[PDB]
């Protein structure tokens, strides 16, 4: 099992860490959503589909920076929605092919009261997501860490 982003940075077998820079909408109105789609960014595959099945869960998802201070929302993951930042681990997504498949995660963040001005600064850390991988075959349980950065500014009308 290995994962890589859209720009080609990989995490080898066994876990690791990587950085993701995401284009966001420039404005989000009061009462609207800021969609951070990560299915188009993070891709994962299974090396031995003939004999092993891999189970992949989002073990934790945390807020940082502007998203921590100005936003609240929910995470969307394989059939259902959960709070963000996450209060527990999610159910499992099964990976059973040697070809890349997206990691189907998305954040729907909406401005809180008393948000205004530059809500998110460019290049700032807005989330860390942990992908936990377990397999049918043996006792392996590895963690793939993902650091999410804003690639532009975001403003909120007051």
């Amino acid at each position, epitope marked *: 099992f290995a994962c890589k982003t859209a720009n080609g940075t990989a995490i080898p077998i066994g876990g690791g860490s990587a950085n993701v820079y995401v284009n966001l909408a420039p404005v989000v109105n009061v009462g609207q*959503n800021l*969609v951070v789609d990560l299915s188009t960014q993070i891709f994962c595959h299974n090396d031995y589909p003939e004999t092993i099945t891999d189970y992949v869960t989002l073990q934790r998802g945390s807020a940082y920076g502007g998203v921590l201070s100005n936003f609240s929302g*929910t995470v*969307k993951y*394989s*059939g*259902s*929605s*959960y709070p963000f930042p996450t209060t*527990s*681990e999610t*159910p*499992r997504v*099964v990976y059973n092919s040697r070809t890349d498949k997206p990691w*189907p995660v*998305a954040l*729907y963040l909406t401005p809180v009261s008393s948000a205004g001005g530059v809500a998110i600064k460019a290049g700032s850390l807005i989330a860390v997501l942990i992908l936990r991988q377990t397999n049918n075959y043996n006792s392996d349980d590895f963690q793939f860490v993902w650091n999410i950065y804003a690639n532009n500014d975001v403003v909120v009308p007051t």
Partner: antibody
Amino acid sequence: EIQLQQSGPERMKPGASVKISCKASGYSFTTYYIHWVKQSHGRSLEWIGYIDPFNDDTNYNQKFKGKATLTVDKSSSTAYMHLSSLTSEDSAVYYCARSYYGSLDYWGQGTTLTVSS
Amino acid sequence: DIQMTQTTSSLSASLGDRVTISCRASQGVNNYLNWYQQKPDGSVKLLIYYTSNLHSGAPSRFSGSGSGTDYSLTISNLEQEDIATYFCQQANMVPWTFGGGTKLEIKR
């Protein structure tokens, strides 16, 4: 409050196809998934699949592959279930439900379908 | 797929009694087991999600417990409005699977 409204009962013929609708109201439509569940005669629940209103990504139960097809129309906040090549075994009640925290949170009123020549 | 079995199809009870309903999964679900109630007229709604959490609007008489492969639903004071069928459902792996159901009846 949160409410899901389905089309009325349907009466079809074997070998045909039918389409039923579910109209969601009271929440941000694209934020939550929509599921479909089938209750037979004898009242055992079977799960069909889910659709993402954001981008129309779907997952189906392996039992209903080929038979069922889900689509959404995010302009008017409506989801559709299509069941085709009907036989006598497809007479049941079909439900649309919203999903939150791993659980089918709100349910439609249920559409009864009869397949009979 | 995860087979989900409920012990008894029918439960006799009397108003005010303490009723308990158990569910069992063929494989461990990391919680993520829900309980639904179907009235005789056919309407369905969620009682408890994630093994212990009351849905908004559900009466406080319902509680949930369990872990791993064994879970239970409890009604503190059985009432006339509580005579219906109950289903357990797992959401740990797709496809989602339901229990067989258990219909309550009054003792006589």
